[PDB]
Design a protein around this ligand. Structure first.
Ligand SMILES: [Mg+2]
Ligand SMILES: [Mg+2]
Ligand SMILES: [Mg+2]
Ligand SMILES: [Mg+2]
Ligand SMILES: [Mg+2]
Ligand SMILES: [Mg+2]
Ligand SMILES: [Mg+2]
Ligand SMILES: [Mg+2]
Ligand SMILES: [Mg+2]
Ligand SMILES: [Mg+2]
Ligand SMILES: [Mg+2]
Ligand SMILES: [Mg+2]
Ligand SMILES: [Mg+2]
Ligand SMILES: [Mg+2]
Ligand SMILES: [Mg+2]
Ligand SMILES: [Mg+2]
Ligand SMILES: [Mg+2]
Ligand SMILES: [Mg+2]
Ligand SMILES: [Mg+2]
Ligand SMILES: [Mg+2]
Ligand SMILES: [Mg+2]
Ligand SMILES: [Mg+2]
Ligand SMILES: [Mg+2]
Ligand SMILES: [Mg+2]
Ligand SMILES: [Mg+2]
Ligand SMILES: [Mg+2]
Ligand SMILES: [Mg+2]
Ligand SMILES: [Mg+2]
Ligand SMILES: [Mg+2]
Ligand SMILES: [Mg+2]
Ligand SMILES: [Mg+2]
Ligand SMILES: [Mg+2]
Ligand SMILES: [Mg+2]
Ligand SMILES: [Mg+2]
Ligand SMILES: [Mg+2]
Ligand SMILES: [Mg+2]
Ligand SMILES: [Mg+2]
Lengths: 144, 129, 151, 155
RNA sequence: GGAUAGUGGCCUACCAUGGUUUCAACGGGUAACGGGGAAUAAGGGUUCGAUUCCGGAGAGGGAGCCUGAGAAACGGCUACCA
RNA sequence: CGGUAAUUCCAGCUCCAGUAGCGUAUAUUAAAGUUGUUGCAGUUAAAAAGCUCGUAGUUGAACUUUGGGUCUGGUUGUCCGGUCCGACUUUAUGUCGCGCACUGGUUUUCAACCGGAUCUUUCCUUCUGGCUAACCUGUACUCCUUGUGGGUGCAGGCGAACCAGGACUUUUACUUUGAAAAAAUUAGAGUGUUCAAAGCAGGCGAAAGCUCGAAUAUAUUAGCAUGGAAUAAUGGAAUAGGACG
RNA sequence: AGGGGAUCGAAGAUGAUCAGAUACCGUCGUAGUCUUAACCAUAAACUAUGCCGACUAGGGAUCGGGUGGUGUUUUUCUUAUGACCCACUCGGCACCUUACGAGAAAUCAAAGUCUUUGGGUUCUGGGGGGAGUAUGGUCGCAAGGCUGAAACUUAAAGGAAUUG
RNA sequence: GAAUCUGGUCAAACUUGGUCAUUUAGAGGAACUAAAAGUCGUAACAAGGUUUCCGUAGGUGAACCUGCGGAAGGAUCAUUA
RNA sequence: CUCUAACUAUAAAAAUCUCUCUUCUC
């Protein structure tokens, strides 16, 4: 019963067999293969500075209709291109395209949160200053 | 094929106890079962039991008194330190007020408390309570 | 109930009695048993045949009970032991018989399968005997020295 | 071993720094020096009466035994004057409270004083290094045959 | 036999054909210096360890070397490459 | 949630949670009995090779000294011995209290609870000398109320009470003990750093110098030494080439 | 590849039905269907239950063997067989009843003896898609088989039962 | 006792080739995901209106259909009326 | 407290479907 070996001298397989089944957990596979280092433009980085190109509106899914004000950006650290979201009401018109913007994660471990298809990342800092600082009227964009 | 006759013995004991019987026929009847049952009996889970010669491996028939609740064998006889005894007692026995982990010692077959007072420890066999 | 090569679980066998010593009514002499054993061996009958014949014809229950020793050991002490143990020799005989049948008629495939089973058993038994060192460690069973040992 | 006339190769194998005087009026065999290696091990008689040289012989040569003592089984004999000993052992993996069969292969150097066959169990001793891999000399073949004692059966 | 401070295919000459491996050798990757340890916690474990201590390695990359008990040194030299 | 009464957006007012901290993001740990050795599922939810043989691996029947008898070392609770604790109060005796707050025999049984030596057709490597440690010595003989309570005492001969040399050592795995496993970290003793994180200090004289320290455990793997003999393996004597003389 | 060539029928040819029907119905008809040696090795190759063990509850029949009948007809007067009837027992496909065990249930006499968690053992799975796809091997003439991902995309897919 | 110089020796480098590894364009092609109010049909879930499903082979705009063997997850646990 | 007998006989065609899914506390 319980079709795994139980003898004293079977240790080997009990290790190596586990060493096989660990390849089922996606977390473990990503960690050993380093897929976070080839794909997923953040090379393990929680934040990256990119240059914004153009401001886009992205539709939403079935139960929710609204134009999410997303934004394209090419990342300095690798040159790849991604799409991010502007995480407050009146902040798209803070971007001022061709601007240094600092991108962070987006709350679902490299996935798409909620009803915004084809995006993976928030936006935190624009022109050095943090976006939430602008939206709270605590600091002002340099406009340089 | 049969591998550890002690496991078969205790499995028959548990099966026949749960059904409420009073006697059990242990078939292979090796030394270790005999010592196990003397330990059992001196603790009291079992009454006056019996061995039978067969010119081959003999047999046991054991009387019960319903005093027992469950027995069992830890078939891969693990090497236990004198320290790791408390680990097995916690993981197997219901509550330390009673219960007995049965292990083979340099002295011989022996329950855990005897092992701790004799300050010896060997390989674990089973658990009864 | 093992029956390595067939899921059959039977237990057809014999339960020899509890009395290790001879039956009280036996009148034959243990020695005379020994001489008839050796003469039947001279006739060439294998120790299984020896035992069955001594059980059928005479009060010989188990030669171990009567003479205090077993038939193959009597033969070995008397120097009539065969070079190949009887069970093994029967395995070779069966295997070569099946081989002859198979080569005679090709398309029979269950014959081939049973031949594979028999070769598995014979390799297994030869391994055992080599470990106990009855056979020479170089004793090998394939096809042609097989046929020679058939002779 | 060195196998039939140790005086074989292009140079002479003299037991180092020992002199047998031709001038001696006895014509004795030779001054075949040796020593008791210690550790309660008896030198074999063939070590004294032998005719080999084996600078690396722990019993007649220059090498000395100290340190570790191992007990293994001969697994390979094919190389000259030297042996390969298998050591099987157990390794306790703690994550499963279990044991793991493992084996190492230790080379060693056998004096001609010793006869070794595959399957023998050998008490071997650590020594001053001999070669790239050899760091041991054989000191006692415990089972010369063991189960190969008997070779026939004639009651 | 040479060379070493000294054992050693360490190297040379002449021999032999051996050595390891499904008990995972060899090869490939490591965003791996190893370790004392850190986080984590019924018990059993999982992950991390660049770094306060211990060893090892390196002073752009490789090689070569004088002095000196001690270096193949680099805030010491020689040469090539960048 | 939001499509005209939005407890979900955006504000105001209240209120919640944490607080000189709180909020994110990517990792990782517990949750996760969703990596399962303890501790997973495999009829249909993912999953049992189409079936069989088979090397390596894994695991593999039962049985070979168990009972008894004694003496005896202790460790526990007995009866408690002396010391004396309380109601009893400013202070002492008695009385009466937990039936003894600390020192004591434990054959009054007792019960364990580990031992040790022993006899059972029952060896504990056993010799080779030591050394005899020890008296079976018994010799000169009793020194002592007559009584072996106890002595000056040396040839056979008591060997584990101890040495120290060869003979052999079946081998292990296992287990207990010990030695080892740097410090720092962890643990944890002591210590009014004003408490604490910490630190390894400090404390005490009457300040006239007199002292307490800087406690301990763990590391599990490999190696070393050591007591054990159930479990598990291996080993003998079968051609006798077997043991002792 | 060689031999056969009845039937039946992928392909094709047809006549219907329909909006279309080169599909289902209807007729003919090639390769195959059958063989002889060699490849192919996949099937819902399903009992969707791996193998070897021990135990645990009641009932019947059934298949193979062997047991005992003062048994029946057998019939050869009578014994012998055979065939039956009974009480068995060992093994096999299974079945019925039940839960006092399990399961999430459907159900299972094993899918029980599993939190009161350890008989011995192999091989598989870790949300669904991507996908048995990409690629490299490897076997095969070919068809293809074994081996075998990832990027990426989603809050479900799925199981059993309940009521409509 | 210098420059210089014979031999080797360690040999970093250099040239041309070969080799493999990784980044890297890459005309074009085949995809796949999300995108739900395009278009052609309606195979599947009921006997899905030809029972489904599997392997294999063929053809077809598409789902598919057909053949040969299977299976019930079938719509039958059942004829010893 | 004795038993095992009945039985029939159909199928032509029917494709598709735009929203809107909303609490249970005494
Ligand atoms: Mg590391
Ligand atoms: Mg580190
Ligand atoms: Mg350092
Ligand atoms: Mg350096
Ligand atoms: Mg630099
Ligand atoms: Mg100096
Ligand atoms: Mg340097
Ligand atoms: Mg420096
Ligand atoms: Mg300089
Ligand atoms: Mg409102
Ligand atoms: Mg608000
Ligand atoms: Mg937990
Ligand atoms: Mg699970
Ligand atoms: Mg399904
Ligand atoms: Mg499924
Ligand atoms: Mg299957
Ligand atoms: Mg199957
Ligand atoms: Mg095997
Ligand atoms: Mg056993
Ligand atoms: Mg430390
Ligand atoms: Mg601390
Ligand atoms: Mg038509
Ligand atoms: Mg057609
Ligand atoms: Mg047709
Ligand atoms: Mg036709
Ligand atoms: Mg398949
Ligand atoms: Mg998946
Ligand atoms: Mg797929
Ligand atoms: Mg491919
Ligand atoms: Mg359903
Ligand atoms: Mg020069
Ligand atoms: Mg339809
Ligand atoms: Mg249909
Ligand atoms: Mg129709
Ligand atoms: Mg239709
Ligand atoms: Mg259905
Ligand atoms: Mg339409």
């Amino acid at each position: 019963g319980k079709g795994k070996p139980r003898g004293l001298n079977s240790a080997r397989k009990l290790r190596v067999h586990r060493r096989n089944n660990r390849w089922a957990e996606t977390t473990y596979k990503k960690r050993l293969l380093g897929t976070a280092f080839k794909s997923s433009p953040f090379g393990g980085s929680s934040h990256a500075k990119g240059i914004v190109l153009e401001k886009i509106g992205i539709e939403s899914k079935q139960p929710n209709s609204a134009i999410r004000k997303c934004v394209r950006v090419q990342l300095i650290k690798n040159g790849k291109k991604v799409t991010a979201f502007v995480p407050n009401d009146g902040c798209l018109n803070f971007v001022d395209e061709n601007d240094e913007v600092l991108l962070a994660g987006f709350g679902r471990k490299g996935k798409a949160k909620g009803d915004i298809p084809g995006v993976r990342f928030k936006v935190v800092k624009v022109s050095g200053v943090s976006l939430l600082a602008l939206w709270k009227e605590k600091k002002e964009k340099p406009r340089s | 094929t049969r591998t550890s006759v002690l496991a078969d013995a205790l499995n028959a004991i548990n099966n026949a106890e749960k059904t409420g019987k009073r006697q059990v026929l242990i078939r292979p009847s090796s030394k270790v079962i005999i010592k196990f049952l003397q330990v059992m009996q001196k603790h009291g889970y079992i009454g006056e039991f019996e061995y039978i010669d067969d010119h081959r491996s003999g047999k046991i028939v054991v009387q019960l008194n319903g005093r027992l609740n469950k027995c069992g064998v830890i078939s891969p006889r693990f090497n236990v330190k004198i320290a790791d005894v408390e680990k097995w007692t916690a993981n197997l026995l219901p509550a330390r007020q009673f219960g007995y982990v049965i292990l083979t010692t340099s002295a011989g077959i022996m329950d855990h408390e005897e092992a701790h007072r004799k300050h010896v420890s060997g390989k674990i066999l089973g658990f009864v309570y | 109930m093992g029956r390595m090569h067939s899921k059959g679980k039977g237990m057809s066998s014999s339960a020899i009695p509890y009395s290790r010593n001879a039956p009280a009514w036996f009148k034959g002499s243990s020695d005379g048993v020994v001489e008839q054993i050796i003469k039947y061996a001279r006739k060439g009958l294998t120790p299984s045949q020896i035992g069955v014949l001594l059980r059928d014809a005479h009060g010989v229950t188990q030669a171990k009970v009567i003479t205090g020793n077993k038939i193959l050991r009597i033969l070995k002490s008397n120097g009539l032991a065969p070079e190949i143990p009887e069970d093994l020799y029967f395995l070779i005989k069966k295997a070569v018989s099946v081989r002859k049948h198979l080569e005679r008629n090709r398309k029979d495939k269950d014959a081939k399968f049973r031949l594979i089973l028999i070769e598995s058993r014979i390799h297994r038994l030869a391994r055992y005997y080599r470990t106990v060192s009855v056979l020479p460690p170089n004793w090998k069973y394939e096809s042609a020295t097989a046929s020679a040992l058939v002779n | 071993s060195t196998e039939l006339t140790v005086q074989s190769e292009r140079a002479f194998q003299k037991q180092p720094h020992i002199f047998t005087n031709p001038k001696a009026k006895a014509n004795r065999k030779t001054k075949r020096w040796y020593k008791n290696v210690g550790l309660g091990f008896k030198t074999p008689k063939t070590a004294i009466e032998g005719s080999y040289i084996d600078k690396k012989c722990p019993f007649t040569g220059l090498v000395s035994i100290r340190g570790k003592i191992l007990t293994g089984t001969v697994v390979s004999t094919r190389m000259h004057r030297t042996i390969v000993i298998r050591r099987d052992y157990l390794h306790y993996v703690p994550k499963y409270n279990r044991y793991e069969k493992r084996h190492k292969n230790v080379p060693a150097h056998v004096s001609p004083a010793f006869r070794v066959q595959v399957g023998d169990i050998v008490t071997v001793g650590q020594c001053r290094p001999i070669s790239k891999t050899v760091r041991f000399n054989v000191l006692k073949v415990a089972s010369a045959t063991g189960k190969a004692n008997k070779q026939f059966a004639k009651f």
